[PDB]
């Protein structure tokens, strides 16, 4: 789940797009 | 925004700025 990478380290546009609707 | 150690509200803002007016499924408790 997103919090295991993007609250602990960096989310970037190409990773963030994976959680787009 | 710019690539950094996001979380919570900043992560919701980043997801909105990437995905656009469409919206996204990650919306945490605050």
Q: What's the number of domains chain B is made of?
A: 1
Three-state SS letters, chain B: CCCECCCHHHHHHHHHHHHHHHCECCCCCC
In DSSP notation, A1-21 reads -THHHHTTS-B-HHHHGGGB-
CA distance B7 to chain A (A): 4
Query: Which residue, A13, A11, A7, is CA-closest to B28?
Result: A7
Q: Ramachandran region of residue A11, left (φ > 0), alpha (ψ -120 to 50) or beta? A: beta
Neighbours of A18 (CB within 10 A): 10
| Cβ–Cβ below 8 Å for B22 and A21 | yes
| Cβ–Cβ below 8 Å for A21 and B26 | no
Could you list the residue range(s) of the whole structural domain that residue B13 is in? 1-30
Burial tier of A14 (Cβ tally within 10 Å: 0-12, 13-18, 19+): exposed
């Amino acid at each position: 789940g997103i919090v295991e990478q993007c609250c602990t380290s960096i989310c970037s546009l190409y990773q963030l797009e994976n959680y787009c609707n | 925004f710019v690539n950094q150690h996001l979380c919570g509200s900043h992560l919701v803002e980043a997801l909105y700025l990437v995905c656009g007016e469409r919206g996204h499924f990650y919306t945490p408790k605050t």
